[PDB]
Design a protein around this ligand. Structure first.
Ligand SMILES: Cc1c(C(=O)c2c[nH]n(C)c2=O)ccc(S(C)(=O)=O)c1C1=NOCC1
Ligand SMILES: Cc1c(C(=O)c2c[nH]n(C)c2=O)ccc(S(C)(=O)=O)c1C1=NOCC1
Ligand SMILES: [Co+2]
Ligand SMILES: [Co+2]
Lengths: 380, 380
């Protein structure tokens, strides 16, 4: 059941913004590790004396890496005279975010029809304002409200090229990498209490709970009208044998924040081959693969969807598999993206639910908690 | 003339430590960009609740990348109970360094016979103490004094594997990259006033001025007894037509600091081929090459040292060439390593002065300032 109760018109995920201490180095690492090309910049070379921002793109996926310059470069400016291309940016906020959380996501940005309306309606419905709507070069409106922890939900809308003041990256600098990643599927937050977090976010968006079908967590998924914007939220379960990974997140992150980003690949096998090639030469590592018993147990579960070959390929790459009552999903998880055991990345591909493919086809892998535990009872 | 006036026994450059906001991402980028393997770690997985430190090595070159964790992970510790592997580390100092300077070098570390003696004698001779000598697992002594800005000169000495508490990196994680870089040749500081900086550093080390042979700078090189430890220092020249790049450094860095690191390659041609292959896929960019007139002018200057082929190869790669009265050097410069126009890297290879090769053979490229200007008068 989907009540389609969005309080304003939402389109798709637009971009994810990381707040960094050095944007160059994080961006170059991510570019090579994920096969995303350098697409636009806003920095000293573009007249921006406030922050360095570098945009990586793969298909529709947009990753933005931003870091502050010395405040002294812009000490003469005021907000009316600012050279920043992202007017919500604040040196103190950025430095405090990075020093508190380490590398992580500051903004989950969605495109909307009218960012000013989305902000006003959100705030009228309990959203805590973070940055008021601002119109950029009479073309793009941007506004921000608090999502959880120090993460904001950013509304972007276009009257009619990333943002004004960003320049296209020179053809010599932008190598056309591509490992098959195409768009953001979902963005997951970790909080201490799921109930109040859900109430808040569902409160100001009108997003509805996405239906699904004891490992230390409870969760729930909020979804937009066409369920293409998917925002799961986790809370820890205390008192379990194995200490809750959600609680470990909260301790090392210094509170709530974005836990993982799920990136849809048009070919998860090519994506994982390409990423695994680069794990030890500057890219990303992957969590330990499941035991071969897990892959022997796949024939009974998805033998009508994956051939023995495609199952074998899953085993080569460590890919996990789950199934809805509607569809099937292939997924796998990176190790944390930075120093702390906090944010990681999920690679996903969904099979089924053709109408275009409907959102969340196959679910989010909830069944893989039990199937992993069961399969990892292969000590005999 | 070399008075060999070191006030304590100095061996060689031991390592360079960068202070980062996320050590993982900087280290992975540098590893791929420079062909340096992951050699040791000290982090959560090794019991270090204070800082993440990752060591990259190429030949004798050691690059250390360190970032702080949340202070809360170690809030119960005191210095006697610390889990940090680098006892000089301080959360507040590291965060203040990175927020003030952005990504850059915190420590120039040299190996000495006796780090406790080197510290005591240095401080008796005007050095500003930064971290007192501390003995690690009864095996290694480490001590730090101020060098310039927020950069320290670190003394390391071994009674008899990087530092205690560091673990070797698993054979699966450490890919054996190597683009030919073998050791640190020199480390250059930028200061507002050369005179007082030289007086200070020469004051507490006994390092002597290295002999050499209007583009906006003055400089001088301090050297150890065998002139294998080489510490040049620059100051800006104000009032020139083209604004002093040294002054631009000081403004964007918020004061004095390490300007460039010069890394010796055993084969600069292979090194530059390998690095240039990776410039646009996560590695380092290089400054704009000189005009072909520069390379036509090379036959008269080094035609007795480089063949037409090796000169042509220089032209392919943008390599610059200078000559002492003793030797010849090949050099080239990266664009800044991070967001700010501050620290960059020099790749160098020296030809001549065989006895082993004596330090600074060929100089530092001072003649290339005039030769670049002259050659870049090719507008007709
Ligand atoms: C995060 C995760 C998902 C996941 O993406 C979602 C679950 N719920 N929602 C809304 C999600 O997006 C699915 C399976 C597993 S797993 C390895 O157990 O098979 C895991 C992990 N557990 O810890 C490490 C990775
Ligand atoms: C830094 C530099 C050196 C250099 O390494 C040293 C000079 N003195 N000392 C002690 C040095 O180590 C040599 C030639 C040039 S250059 C491009 O002019 O030919 C440059 C640069 N100028 O600005 C950009 C790079
Ligand atoms: Co997920
Ligand atoms: Co140099």
């Amino acid at each position: 059941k989907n009540p389609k109760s969005d309080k304003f018109k939402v389109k798709r995920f637009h971009h994810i913004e990381f707040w960094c201490g050095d944007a160059t180095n994080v961006a170059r690492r991510f570019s090579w590790g994920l096969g995303m090309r350098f697409s636009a910049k806003s920095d000293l070379s573009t007249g921006n004396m406030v922050h360095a921002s570098y945009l990586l793109t793969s298909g529709d996926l947009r990753f933005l890496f931003t870091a502050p310059y010395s405040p002294s470069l812009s000490a003469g400016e005021i907000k009316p005279t600012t050279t920043a291309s992202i007017p919500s940016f604040d040196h103190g906020s950025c430095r405090s975010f990075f020093s508190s959380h380490g590398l992580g996501v500051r903004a989950v940005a969605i495109e909307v029809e009218d960012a000013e309306s989305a902000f006003s309606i959100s705030v009228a419905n309990g959203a805590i304002p973070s940055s008021p709507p601002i119109v950029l070069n009479e073309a793009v409106t941007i506004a921000e409200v608090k999502l959880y922890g120090d993460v904001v939900l950013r509304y972007v809308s276009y009257k009619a090229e990333f943002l004004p003041g960003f320049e296209r990256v020179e053809d010599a600098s932008s190598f056309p990498l591509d490992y098959g990643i195409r768009r953001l599927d979902h963005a997951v937050g970790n909080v201490p209490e799921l109930g109040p977090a859900l109430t808040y976010v569902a409160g100001f968006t009108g997003f509805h709970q996405f239906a699904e079908f004891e490992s230390g967590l409870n969760s729930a998924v909020l979804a937009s009208n066409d369920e293409m914007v998917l925002l799961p939220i986790n809370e820890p379960v205390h008192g379990t044998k194995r200490k809750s990974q959600i609680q470990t997140y909260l301790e090392h992150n210094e509170g709530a924040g974005l836990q993982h980003l799920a990136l849809m690949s048009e070919d998860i096998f090519r994506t994982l081959r390409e990423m695994r090639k680069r794990s030890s030469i500057g890219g990303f590592d992957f969590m330990p693969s499941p035991p071969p018993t897990y892959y022997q147990n796949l024939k009974k579960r998805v033998g009508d969807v994956l051939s023995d070959d495609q199952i074998k390929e899953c085993e080569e790459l460590g890919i996990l598999v789950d199934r809805d009552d509607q569809g099937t999903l292939l997924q796998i998880f990176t190790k944390p993206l930075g120093d702390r055991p906090t944010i990681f990345i999920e690679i996903i591909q969904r099979v089924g639910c053709m109408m275009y493919q409907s959102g969340g086809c196959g679910g989010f892998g909830k069944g893989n908690f039990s199937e992993l535990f069961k399969s990892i009872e292969e000590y005999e």
